[PDB]
Design a protein around this ligand. Structure first.
Ligand code: SF4
Ligand code: SF4
Ligand code: SF4
Ligand code: SF4
Ligand code: FES
Ligand code: FES
Lengths: 635, 635
């Protein structure tokens, strides 16, 4: 079996061989068993929005040509897409809502394990929202910030401030003119679900405008999540760590944190240090906390916790035999982990009331008891380590060096070493002179349909050679880190001369003796909001809207509904946005034409649907170079 | 072509013959073109919640057996069902939210076309919510009521009051013990969408408990909608009118109001009276406003507007050639009406920003301009009448007499003529002595899979002969009214002797010289909340919870997501609840077992899935008689 057709990650390939030997079914096996997949679903031409369904429409040929109620292909496709956007917004904003409640509990004396760790971030957010700080206690400022966060979920006398205060006024004006500013986060999610139900909205343009507005509700949830997590846990600054399965240690208690919301896993990190002695009494060397998915990104960015794996390959960490516990919150967790655990000996633990998995142990985490819960959890992990004393394990000896922690604050600070009072100017100077062709954000998941990481690395290599500044979040950052794109030792190999010169100048001015890494890791999926903050700051410094900047995005291997939401708000804020898997839109030419072309006339952004990564890189470079030409720059 | 296999309504059959002659495609034709429908979708064994899909599971046989991410059949089915519940809740609560904003605008002097029409209802709601009224202006009380309504959409220091203040304390306690009381209406909708996204909740029981809680958010939206519409437009009292296509008049301007929210169509009713002269200047006899679907129910209940048709047969009103305008809000409107209008000459007008139909004329209704908008709309209708002067029409000369307007206030008032200070006691006395075997609520839609009305009338006939008091809402009321079940002249034919005696006693005590009708029309789909108010009042008067009462529900021909939500909250509040179409659950035996059996141990209610209506009636009678036996009553 040619495992490189499943994943380009050599540690994953090794574990796929072990899973095959041992008869453990993987995500790739379940994908093979699903083929050929339903073409009605793949093209978007299926509707189950009422009990007269299921309805389907033949992409081509004879009947059925229309839904039972009269819903056309255009309507069916647009309604389906809208519900996916709403689902994504619901996830990011549920994460943000949880953090808002945590901050409120902390400053009300109800959860002493949590606190204001970043006072600077708290005050800047308060100022951005218009919350007075002068002569106020920090706990009172933070209570007002948490209350403002919660207020953005519902209608009120202002629109969603985590949209209108984070984008330039000119962009807010464009969006307002088209009716796209969200009135409340959960309000928009509910309105989507209403308008897409049977016998309601049935005009493709009207439906899709609703979708764009709900995608801005998702952006607000992302930005709110990043803001609150930085207040609570600290704004990231540059860190050095490692990635891939070789970060597991046979002689340690290996504990993975997995999911998206780090409200508990940040505590796990701190409590694990306190239980090192208890782990060694059990015969381990210590407790080795490692990350999976975006919760892993959160603790990597703030604490340098090494990242074990990501997304599609998450089961492989368990296949080593050395994963003693997998501590779950929610989002992007394959529920197969609970069954695989019976074969690998891993203790899979859920912690959130609305995210349980049959067969996994549940610990009822509460912020008020976080340290207590963390000790209960780590003691299960220690017990599990004890059960495998003397059992052989197979950890691939494969890992990469990762430099990360590039929050927007950290990037501005790094640039400030080149120009103290105008830190964005050195970046803009090098865009203008061509040393930096443009900026590309890689975001989103892996997807079993795409050999793991192949689109991210293929596209990134071409862009880096063409002097594009590449930033990354989520499992796009995961893909790039596991293939060495966050190791500064690879700048010479990967980067064009102009980009190398800039990365070197910034790195050497920050006391590194070497360049910044080839790709800047800006954090988790909610931390796509950090990229928005950087791009909005560049737009404001230049006096233009985002749809004039040479900035693009690529969800090169997208999977989750919240990647669909992110891609949609990237378009809505003005960016050319590549997606490297087929979204369920191709069954409607009119909807595809809106999303890939005529939306440019509304927001200035547009989707670029391209499954071939070499072709996608050329298309992204053309989009960047079109923006350069619109600014009168050489390219 | 045997049209009685499509609809049991003889006027619909006549129009199906006309549509066939004229080559106009109908809902039944589009259904035939869809067969055979996808069995994966029909059984619930399909998931499109991420871009790795579509995933399907064979009900029986070999692979695929599990989703790509590991999602089991139980998880896939429960997630799909939860999203349908959330969609239903989003519709009913969007309707309620609209009315709350309308009331607020009215009492703030911003929409003079609206007002407090039912001061008694306003004060009773205020008292139920704990809002002080003594020494307060009505406009201030109503502002506080509207603000409370809007607050129930989001988290706050109280749970959703339109749940906790409308059910008995003992029922609230049972629900609270299981974690089922909603925290906020839109909060629960968003949490469903989150928990059902990829890699989140993956335990069938946990998912379904979430669904039960979101169904209570739907109940709150229903009850809020009824409360606010009664304040604004008046609480229904008994009315006499007619139903079926024969209510159209060739010589008049025929204007249908269609959808669910009557915020504009109540205005249309009043403004149409003012434009009678203008209609006659155009050569019509007047303006003939008729109802379709639940907006039609709203104006039938409050004003006696005749109901033209319902649900699955809505296109047939247009096929007569006499429908000059169809005025749309949202929900349950087949979008085919916009295409059929090109053939029939009808002017189809949309009015709500989030519900447009390509090819229909849109009028941007605003409460602040409601009368202005209504005149613009009725002038389009008058112009359309003028275009058909001299054209032959085919209106089936088929109509029934309808007695309706049985709000819970009206029912209590009618009973009070038999016992002035204890009005529920005569009803309970006759349940105890067996003259009334129990109560059955018919609710929900028609569905093209079921010959139109056949389940409603078959089940109702059997129950009425067994002395069941039958109440009805929505298009269940529509089905029963169009077959004579709301005409008191049919009591002798349809009703058992004990039920006839009770209907006669109440009718004769209310100065009718005749009985109440065989079935009591309690209004629109949101007005299922009225049935909750009646049943909760009976429970309180008897000192028991709802799951001890001989009360059942039947969504005998269910279609829309909000019928799924209603059926689910009927179960959650404690009722045996029949559904007469297959919901997409049969692909999971564990989920089916929870919903039809083990949920009894949680809420005391349960679903009864039965597609054969004779069998369903026997099962409903067994459920009623089991409740009678639990109270120690003969049966
Ligand atoms: S909403 Fe229309 S297209 Fe969708 S399942 Fe129902 S009848 Fe079919
Ligand atoms: S990128 Fe996608 S797979 Fe990875 S965790 Fe942040 S949503 Fe999930
Ligand atoms: S969520 Fe799981 S079952 Fe659903 S489409 Fe994605 S991989 Fe398939
Ligand atoms: S019953 Fe069903 S079809 Fe009829 S209007 Fe009130 S939801 Fe729609
Ligand atoms: S017919 Fe396959 S996704 Fe519905
Ligand atoms: S395979 Fe037909 S509904 Fe998805």
């Amino acid at each position: 079996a040619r495992q490189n057709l499943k994943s380009t990650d050599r540690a994953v390939q090794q574990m796929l061989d072990k899973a095959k030997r041992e008869g453990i079914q993987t995500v790739w096996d379940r994908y093979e068993a699903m083929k050929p997949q339903c073409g009605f679903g793949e093209t978007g031409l299926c509707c189950r929005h009422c009990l007269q369904g299921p309805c389907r429409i033949n992409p081509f040929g004879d009947e059925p040509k229309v839904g039972i109620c009269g819903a056309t292909a255009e309507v069916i496709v647009a309604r389906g897409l809208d519900r996916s956007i709403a689902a994504g917004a619901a996830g990011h904003s549920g994460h943000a809502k949880h953090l808002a409640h945590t901050l409120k509990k902390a400053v009300q004396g109800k959860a002493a394990s949590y606190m204001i760790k970043d006072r600077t971030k708290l005050h800047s957010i308060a100022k951005r929202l218009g919350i007075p700080t002068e002569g106020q206690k920090d706990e009172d400022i933070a209570l007002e910030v948490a209350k403002a966060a919660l207020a953005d979920f519902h209608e009120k006398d202002t629109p969603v401030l985590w949209v209108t205060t984070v984008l330039p006024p000119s962009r807010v004006k464009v969006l307002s003119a088209h009716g796209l500013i969200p009135a409340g986060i959960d309000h928009e999610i509910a309105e989507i679900m209403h308008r897409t139900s049977m016998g309601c909205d049935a005009d493709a343009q009207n439906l899709l405008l609703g979708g764009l507005r709900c995608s801005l509700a998702d952006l607000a949830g992302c930005y709110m999540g990043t803001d609150l997590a930085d207040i609570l846990f600290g704004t990231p600054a540059p860190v050095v760590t490692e990635s891939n399965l070789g970060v597991l240690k046979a002689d340690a208690v290996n504990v993975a944190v997995h999911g998206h919301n780090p409200v508990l896993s940040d505590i796990i990190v701190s409590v694990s240090k306190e239980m090192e002695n208890e782990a060694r009494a059990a015969g381990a060397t210590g407790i080795n906390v490692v990350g999976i998915c975006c919760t892993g990104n959160e603790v990597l960015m703030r604490h340098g916790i090494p990242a074990c794996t990501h997304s599609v390959s998450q089961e492989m960490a368990m296949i080593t035999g050395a994963l003693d516990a997998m501590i779950l919150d929610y989002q992007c967790i394959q529920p197969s982990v609970a069954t695989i655990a019976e074969c690998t000996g891993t203790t899979v633990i859920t912690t959130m009331e609305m995210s349980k998995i049959t067969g996994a142990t549940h610990v009822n985490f509460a912020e008020e008891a976080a340290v207590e819960n963390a000790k209960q959890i780590l003691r299960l992990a220690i017990d599990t380590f004890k059960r495998r004393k003397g059992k052989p394990v197979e950890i691939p000896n494969i890992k990469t060096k990762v430099v990360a922690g590039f929050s927007t604050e950290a990037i501005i600070n790094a640039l400030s070493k080149l120009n103290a009072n105008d830190p964005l100017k050195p970046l803009i100077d090098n865009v203008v002179n061509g040393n930096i062709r443009g900026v590309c954000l890689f975001a989103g998941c892996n997807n079993v349909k795409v050999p793991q990481d192949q689109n991210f690395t293929t596209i990134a290599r071409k862009l880096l050679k063409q002097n594009v500044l590449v930033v990354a979040t989520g499992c796009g950052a995961g893909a790039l880190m596991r293939h060495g794109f966050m190791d500064p030792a690879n700048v010479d190999e990967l980067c064009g001369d102009g980009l190398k010169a800039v990365l070197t100048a910034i790195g050497e001015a920050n006391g590194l003796g070497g360049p910044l890494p080839p790709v800047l890791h800006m954090g988790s999926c909610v931390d796509n909001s950090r990229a928005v903050a950087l791009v909005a700051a560049l737009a404001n410094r230049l006096g233009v809207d985002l749809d004039r900047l040479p900035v693009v995005a690529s969800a090169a291997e997208a999977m989750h509904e919240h990647a669909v939401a992110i891609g949609t708000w990237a378009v809505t804020i003005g960016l050319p946005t590549h997606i490297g898997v087929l979204p369920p839109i191709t069954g409607s030419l009119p909807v595809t034409q809106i999303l890939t072309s005529s939306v440019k006339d509304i927001t200035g952004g547009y989707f670029i649907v391209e499954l071939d990564p070499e072709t996608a890189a050329d298309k992204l470079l053309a989009a960047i170079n079109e923006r350069r030409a619109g600014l009168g720059l050489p390219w």
